[PDB]
Design a protein around this nucleic acid. Sequence first.
RNA 1: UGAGGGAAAGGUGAAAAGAACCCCGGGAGGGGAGUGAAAUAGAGCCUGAAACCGUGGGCUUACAAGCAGUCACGGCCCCGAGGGGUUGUGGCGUGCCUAUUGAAGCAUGAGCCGGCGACUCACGGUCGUGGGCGAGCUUAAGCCGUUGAGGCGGAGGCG
RNA 2: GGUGGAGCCUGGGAGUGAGGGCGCGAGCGAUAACGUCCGCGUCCGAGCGCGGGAACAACCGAGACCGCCAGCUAAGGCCCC
RNA 3: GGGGAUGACCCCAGGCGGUAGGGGAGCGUUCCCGAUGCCGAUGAAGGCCGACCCGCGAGGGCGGCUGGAGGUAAGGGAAGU
Lengths: 140, 51, 59, 101, 116, 112, 22
Amino acid sequence: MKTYVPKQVEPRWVLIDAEGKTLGRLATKIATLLRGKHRPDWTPNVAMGDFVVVVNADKIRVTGKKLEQKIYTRYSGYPGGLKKIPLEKMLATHPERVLEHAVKGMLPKGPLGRRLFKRLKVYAGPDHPHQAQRPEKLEV
Amino acid sequence: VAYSGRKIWPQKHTGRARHGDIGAPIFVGGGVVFGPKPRDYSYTLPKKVRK
Amino acid sequence: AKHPVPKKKTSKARRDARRSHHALTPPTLVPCPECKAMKPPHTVCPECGYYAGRKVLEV
Amino acid sequence: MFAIVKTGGKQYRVEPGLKLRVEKLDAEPGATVELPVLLLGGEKTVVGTPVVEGASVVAEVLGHGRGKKILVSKFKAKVQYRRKKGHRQPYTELLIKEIRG
Amino acid sequence: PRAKTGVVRRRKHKKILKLAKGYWGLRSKSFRKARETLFAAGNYAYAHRKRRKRDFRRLWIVRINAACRQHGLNYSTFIHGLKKAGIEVDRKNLADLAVREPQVFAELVERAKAAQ
Amino acid sequence: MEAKAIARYVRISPRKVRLVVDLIRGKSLEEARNILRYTNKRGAYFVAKVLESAAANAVNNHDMLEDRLYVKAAYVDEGPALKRVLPRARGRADIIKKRTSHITVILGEKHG
Amino acid sequence: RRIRFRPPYLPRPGRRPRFPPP
RNA sequence: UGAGGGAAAGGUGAAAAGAACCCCGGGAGGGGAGUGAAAUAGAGCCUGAAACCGUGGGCUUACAAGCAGUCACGGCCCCGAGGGGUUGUGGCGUGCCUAUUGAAGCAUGAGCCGGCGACUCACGGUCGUGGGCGAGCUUAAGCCGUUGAGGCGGAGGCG
RNA sequence: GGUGGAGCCUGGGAGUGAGGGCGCGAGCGAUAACGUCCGCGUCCGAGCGCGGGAACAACCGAGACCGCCAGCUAAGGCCCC
RNA sequence: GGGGAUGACCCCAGGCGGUAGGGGAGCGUUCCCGAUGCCGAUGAAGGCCGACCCGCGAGGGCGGCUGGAGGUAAGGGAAGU
Ligand SMILES: [Mg+2]
Ligand SMILES: [Mg+2]
Ligand SMILES: [Mg+2]
Ligand SMILES: [Mg+2]
Ligand SMILES: [Mg+2]
Ligand SMILES: [Mg+2]
Ligand SMILES: [Mg+2]
Ligand SMILES: [Mg+2]
Ligand SMILES: [Mg+2]
Ligand SMILES: [Mg+2]
Ligand SMILES: [Mg+2]
Ligand SMILES: [Mg+2]
Ligand SMILES: [Mg+2]
Ligand SMILES: [Mg+2]
Ligand SMILES: [Mg+2]
Ligand SMILES: [Mg+2]
Ligand SMILES: [Mg+2]
Ligand SMILES: [Mg+2]
Ligand SMILES: [Mg+2]
Ligand SMILES: [Mg+2]
Ligand SMILES: [Mg+2]
Ligand SMILES: [Mg+2]
Ligand SMILES: [Mg+2]
Ligand SMILES: [Mg+2]
Ligand SMILES: [Mg+2]
Ligand SMILES: [Mg+2]
Ligand SMILES: [Mg+2]
Ligand SMILES: [Mg+2]
Ligand SMILES: [Mg+2]
Ligand SMILES: [Mg+2]
Ligand SMILES: [Mg+2]
Ligand SMILES: [Mg+2]
Ligand SMILES: [Mg+2]
Ligand SMILES: [Mg+2]
Ligand SMILES: [Mg+2]
Ligand SMILES: [Mg+2]
Ligand SMILES: [Mg+2]
Ligand SMILES: [Mg+2]
Ligand SMILES: [Mg+2]
Ligand SMILES: [Mg+2]
Ligand SMILES: [Mg+2]
Ligand SMILES: [Mg+2]
Ligand SMILES: [Mg+2]
Ligand SMILES: [Mg+2]
Ligand SMILES: [Mg+2]
Ligand SMILES: [Mg+2]
Ligand SMILES: [Mg+2]
Ligand SMILES: [Mg+2]
Ligand SMILES: [Mg+2]
Ligand SMILES: [Mg+2]
Ligand SMILES: [Mg+2]
Ligand SMILES: [Mg+2]
Ligand SMILES: [Mg+2]
Ligand SMILES: [Mg+2]
Ligand SMILES: [Mg+2]
Ligand SMILES: [Mg+2]
Ligand SMILES: [Mg+2]
Ligand SMILES: [Mg+2]
Ligand SMILES: [Mg+2]
Ligand SMILES: [Mg+2]
Ligand SMILES: [Mg+2]
Ligand SMILES: [Mg+2]
Ligand SMILES: [Mg+2]
Ligand SMILES: [Mg+2]
Ligand SMILES: [Mg+2]
Ligand SMILES: [Mg+2]
Ligand SMILES: [Mg+2]
Ligand SMILES: [Mg+2]
Ligand SMILES: [Mg+2]
Ligand SMILES: [Mg+2]
Ligand SMILES: [Mg+2]
Ligand SMILES: [Mg+2]
Ligand SMILES: [Mg+2]
Ligand SMILES: [Mg+2]
Ligand SMILES: [Mg+2]
Ligand SMILES: [Mg+2]
Ligand SMILES: [Mg+2]
Ligand SMILES: [Mg+2]
Ligand SMILES: [Mg+2]
Ligand SMILES: [Mg+2]
Ligand SMILES: [Mg+2]
Ligand SMILES: [Mg+2]
Ligand SMILES: [Mg+2]
Ligand SMILES: [Mg+2]
Ligand SMILES: [Mg+2]
Ligand SMILES: [Mg+2]
Ligand SMILES: [Mg+2]
Ligand SMILES: [Mg+2]
Ligand SMILES: [Mg+2]
Ligand SMILES: [Mg+2]
Ligand SMILES: [Mg+2]
Ligand SMILES: [Mg+2]
Ligand SMILES: [Mg+2]
Ligand SMILES: [Mg+2]
Ligand SMILES: [Mg+2]
Ligand SMILES: [Mg+2]
Ligand SMILES: [Mg+2]
Ligand SMILES: [Mg+2]
Ligand SMILES: [Mg+2]
Ligand SMILES: [Mg+2]
Ligand SMILES: [Mg+2]
Ligand SMILES: [Mg+2]
Ligand SMILES: [Mg+2]
Ligand SMILES: [Mg+2]
Ligand SMILES: [Mg+2]
Ligand SMILES: [Mg+2]
Ligand SMILES: [Mg+2]
Ligand SMILES: [Mg+2]
Ligand SMILES: [Mg+2]
Ligand SMILES: [Mg+2]
Ligand SMILES: [Mg+2]
Ligand SMILES: [Mg+2]
Ligand SMILES: [Mg+2]
Ligand SMILES: [Mg+2]
Ligand SMILES: [Mg+2]
Ligand SMILES: [Mg+2]
Ligand SMILES: [Mg+2]
Ligand SMILES: [Mg+2]
Ligand SMILES: [Mg+2]
Ligand SMILES: [Mg+2]
Ligand SMILES: [Mg+2]
Ligand SMILES: [Mg+2]
Ligand SMILES: [Mg+2]
Ligand SMILES: [Mg+2]
Ligand SMILES: [Mg+2]
Ligand SMILES: [Mg+2]
Ligand SMILES: [Mg+2]
Ligand SMILES: [Mg+2]
Ligand SMILES: [Mg+2]
Ligand SMILES: [Mg+2]
Ligand SMILES: [Mg+2]
Ligand SMILES: [Mg+2]
Ligand SMILES: [Mg+2]
Ligand SMILES: [Mg+2]
Ligand SMILES: [Mg+2]
Ligand SMILES: [Mg+2]
Ligand SMILES: [Mg+2]
Ligand SMILES: [Mg+2]
Ligand SMILES: [Mg+2]
Ligand SMILES: [Mg+2]
Ligand SMILES: [Mg+2]
Ligand SMILES: [Mg+2]
Ligand SMILES: [Mg+2]
Ligand SMILES: [Mg+2]
Ligand SMILES: [Mg+2]
Ligand SMILES: [Mg+2]
Ligand SMILES: [Mg+2]
Ligand SMILES: [Mg+2]
Ligand SMILES: [Mg+2]
Ligand SMILES: [Mg+2]
Ligand SMILES: [Mg+2]
Ligand SMILES: [Mg+2]
Ligand SMILES: [Mg+2]
Ligand SMILES: [Mg+2]
Ligand SMILES: [Mg+2]
Ligand SMILES: [Mg+2]
Ligand SMILES: [Mg+2]
Ligand SMILES: [Mg+2]
Ligand SMILES: [Mg+2]
Ligand SMILES: [Mg+2]
Ligand SMILES: [Mg+2]
Ligand SMILES: [Mg+2]
Ligand SMILES: [Mg+2]
Ligand SMILES: [Mg+2]
Ligand SMILES: [Mg+2]
Ligand SMILES: [Mg+2]
Ligand SMILES: [Mg+2]
Ligand SMILES: [Mg+2]
Ligand SMILES: [Mg+2]
Ligand SMILES: [Zn+2]
């Protein structure tokens, strides 16, 4: 008897209020939703997980002195091209990047991991455009 | 074998390998190694055994 | 100057790769309004010798 | 109905009508055997702890064979250690006759 | 008498080349390269026969666990549950059960909780 | 019904001629003929001749009609190469391969 | 900046070419 | 310069019956026709491997990270509870030989392919072994015979 | 006590006579060295086969006859990769 | 180690990482006896396929295409293997 593999499945759209949630710990959950690993029919080689919409990212939360000390870093390829941008500033300029960059790092590398990232739709502020998909609210 | 004794080309600095004469068995048309020679294959099987 | 040389043989795949731009484009050719034969535009028609309506060449 | 039976050190889910290759059993082809049952499901569900005392699944043995050859190859670099073995695992083909609840 | 290579070598090479079909570049084309490529794959498969066993059981577990968590318990709990229950169904099947027969898995979960 | 012609041992380099052959593979006899005439390459002169010898064959031997002819397949395989010595500096001599082509054109009829 | 004068390990090139071989 | 060095290069078919004649082409070459059991035996000729170069088809590929494979699943294509080809994703993964304490190694060698290429022979020795005869065993050179026949020869040797 | 790819005896065949890391005991060194020289042990050598250790001959786990889409463990692990 | 009573196969148990190297058992190449035989134009050797059969493997079969005149068993023998 050979292991079960799903035929193509229509993916569930789930929605999550990020407000006040502990950044990183929200982040791990979103990944599992993303990979599909909450589903009993999980298959490692195909995009069979959820689409996660997060809202109120600006209002992510964080322990210790990370606001002032956690530094996101970008390398340009040029001499002297390391950019160090601290979490405070990041939220202050592209708040949605904070959760995004957290989640990214906790998905697999590779083509599929990259596709899974594309299924994460993160927003600043209460509202999001995917009314069409009628996303199911999750409390995590 | 029929060839000369000359070293076809110098020991060092050619870019090619080292060789001596072209009779060496390493060459095509160079001599053989341990190939057959004329040879008596007979021996004296004990008379009693023949009888 | 120290005699640069290729470090590895170029694959069958990689030469042909390079050669992706080697294709010729066929001559651009128009009908000659007089003898209806095909020719480069802007040339005197070498079939009938006409150009701009008139005869310009014995041919 | 179906049954999760266990033969060959492995457990397979069966339904009547099923053709299954399992690890080579000792029964003439054409003979019929009973497999131990571990869970019976579908209409009623019965859970063995670990086997179910009542149930046996009945299989008729369709025949016995040898799998396709797998080359099992060994190479150790820089040592001149190389070994080649052809291998075909014996197996027994079963037809699943009925589930004796 | 003389026994020159003959036909023997060619034949020996083609055996191998045929073994190397589909391989990229000289890997399918050149005897030497083909051979080298094949040592690789000879070891690779042997190793990979071994880990296909691990490859799978992970899937299974990843799966059973997803099903357990719908029923309130985590994986390790579920297992220990079955251990204490004396239910010896394997992870190959627990996993098939989890999909094809949610009721049975549900009841399997039940007994699992009950073992404590 | 097809009809073909081959120039064998044409002493031009395969890589070079293939370029011209390529330009007319799958074209009406008529277009091919136009294309070659105004193609700027020594190989145009040879492909020309095969194409033409081929069409001659099609009409004359094979009952095909000139107005229906098109280049069905065509290709250049390489023949026996002519090796010549090129003298280089410092006493060295390289070896030039004055290469060689076997050009093939195969004409078919375009139904309708 | 090293004081203990660093002798060359190598001779400055070069002398002669093994021309030809044929 | 010279003494001297010193190659490569065999094969149509039984039989030339070695392709009249026509056709395109300056010709080369080719298409028909003819010969032949066969002509991808057509002379650049038995067979006709491999590297190498093409054309046509199937699958595939332009957000991807790679000792090139291997394991798994899926897609397509082929041949008819199976198989074959292909490869999208996923897992795993540091060429081969040499030589070294240690190499994927930024240490050696190797462009690829085909062919040539290296532990032998004689005589003695030493041990093992299969046999013959056993206080004995055995002949050398020669002679006779045989012309793919075996015999005689006791000098000698070992004990 | 111990029946072991134990031991002894006679013979035939070898190969090795560049070692290396680590723990312990010292000398040498500077209570330096991926240092050097011994002793005991071990492993790599030849286990660049497997799990762990991010990756890594010799650190931890463990001595790979072949096959399984079965089960238990070791070191190490159990938030996500 | 038991059966069968001397390799008949069967059953029970244990061993089976490996460089230098020792040992064993085989495969294939050329040639000799087998052979005044035998296979062969109703197709030799050789070449190209094969997802088929045997064999742990080296290999050996069988089939199709090609090739067009040679091949050569069981059992042994010898090497330019
Ligand atoms: Mg959750
Ligand atoms: Mg913004
Ligand atoms: Mg990974
Ligand atoms: Mg001489
Ligand atoms: Mg002489
Ligand atoms: Mg001479
Ligand atoms: Mg001399
Ligand atoms: Mg001399
Ligand atoms: Mg000399
Ligand atoms: Mg001389
Ligand atoms: Mg030298
Ligand atoms: Mg060189
Ligand atoms: Mg050289
Ligand atoms: Mg050389
Ligand atoms: Mg020399
Ligand atoms: Mg020499
Ligand atoms: Mg010589
Ligand atoms: Mg020789
Ligand atoms: Mg010669
Ligand atoms: Mg000679
Ligand atoms: Mg000679
Ligand atoms: Mg010699
Ligand atoms: Mg000699
Ligand atoms: Mg003599
Ligand atoms: Mg002898
Ligand atoms: Mg004698
Ligand atoms: Mg330069
Ligand atoms: Mg200059
Ligand atoms: Mg230079
Ligand atoms: Mg240069
Ligand atoms: Mg270079
Ligand atoms: Mg190339
Ligand atoms: Mg190409
Ligand atoms: Mg390129
Ligand atoms: Mg016009
Ligand atoms: Mg069992
Ligand atoms: Mg079995
Ligand atoms: Mg089986
Ligand atoms: Mg190596
Ligand atoms: Mg390696
Ligand atoms: Mg080696
Ligand atoms: Mg080594
Ligand atoms: Mg090796
Ligand atoms: Mg192999
Ligand atoms: Mg030979
Ligand atoms: Mg040889
Ligand atoms: Mg050969
Ligand atoms: Mg070989
Ligand atoms: Mg052959
Ligand atoms: Mg072979
Ligand atoms: Mg492929
Ligand atoms: Mg290739
Ligand atoms: Mg290629
Ligand atoms: Mg090739
Ligand atoms: Mg493995
Ligand atoms: Mg395995
Ligand atoms: Mg829970
Ligand atoms: Mg347990
Ligand atoms: Mg259990
Ligand atoms: Mg042009
Ligand atoms: Mg005409
Ligand atoms: Mg000169
Ligand atoms: Mg000069
Ligand atoms: Mg060249
Ligand atoms: Mg050249
Ligand atoms: Mg000379
Ligand atoms: Mg010569
Ligand atoms: Mg003849
Ligand atoms: Mg003749
Ligand atoms: Mg004849
Ligand atoms: Mg004529
Ligand atoms: Mg003419
Ligand atoms: Mg003239
Ligand atoms: Mg002519
Ligand atoms: Mg023609
Ligand atoms: Mg003709
Ligand atoms: Mg006829
Ligand atoms: Mg006939
Ligand atoms: Mg033929
Ligand atoms: Mg022929
Ligand atoms: Mg021929
Ligand atoms: Mg002949
Ligand atoms: Mg040919
Ligand atoms: Mg193509
Ligand atoms: Mg991107
Ligand atoms: Mg893409
Ligand atoms: Mg999977
Ligand atoms: Mg597949
Ligand atoms: Mg398939
Ligand atoms: Mg892959
Ligand atoms: Mg996996
Ligand atoms: Mg690597
Ligand atoms: Mg390594
Ligand atoms: Mg190798
Ligand atoms: Mg080497
Ligand atoms: Mg060295
Ligand atoms: Mg060294
Ligand atoms: Mg060294
Ligand atoms: Mg490398
Ligand atoms: Mg190297
Ligand atoms: Mg390096
Ligand atoms: Mg390198
Ligand atoms: Mg170097
Ligand atoms: Mg060296
Ligand atoms: Mg070269
Ligand atoms: Mg090559
Ligand atoms: Mg070779
Ligand atoms: Mg040797
Ligand atoms: Mg010897
Ligand atoms: Mg002796
Ligand atoms: Mg003796
Ligand atoms: Mg005697
Ligand atoms: Mg006696
Ligand atoms: Mg004496
Ligand atoms: Mg004993
Ligand atoms: Mg021992
Ligand atoms: Mg011992
Ligand atoms: Mg001894
Ligand atoms: Mg020996
Ligand atoms: Mg020895
Ligand atoms: Mg030594
Ligand atoms: Mg010494
Ligand atoms: Mg040393
Ligand atoms: Mg020493
Ligand atoms: Mg020491
Ligand atoms: Mg020392
Ligand atoms: Mg030590
Ligand atoms: Mg301690
Ligand atoms: Mg001391
Ligand atoms: Mg110490
Ligand atoms: Mg200090
Ligand atoms: Mg180290
Ligand atoms: Mg040291
Ligand atoms: Mg130390
Ligand atoms: Mg020390
Ligand atoms: Mg040292
Ligand atoms: Mg060593
Ligand atoms: Mg170890
Ligand atoms: Mg290790
Ligand atoms: Mg060891
Ligand atoms: Mg190694
Ligand atoms: Mg590893
Ligand atoms: Mg490790
Ligand atoms: Mg790891
Ligand atoms: Mg590791
Ligand atoms: Mg073992
Ligand atoms: Mg467990
Ligand atoms: Mg523990
Ligand atoms: Mg990641
Ligand atoms: Mg055993
Ligand atoms: Mg062994
Ligand atoms: Mg033995
Ligand atoms: Mg052989
Ligand atoms: Mg033999
Ligand atoms: Mg002879
Ligand atoms: Mg005879
Ligand atoms: Mg005969
Ligand atoms: Mg007959
Ligand atoms: Mg016939
Ligand atoms: Mg036939
Ligand atoms: Mg033969
Ligand atoms: Mg023969
Ligand atoms: Mg044949
Ligand atoms: Mg075969
Ligand atoms: Mg004859
Ligand atoms: Mg024979
Ligand atoms: Mg025989
Ligand atoms: Mg005999
Ligand atoms: Mg030899
Ligand atoms: Zn005109």
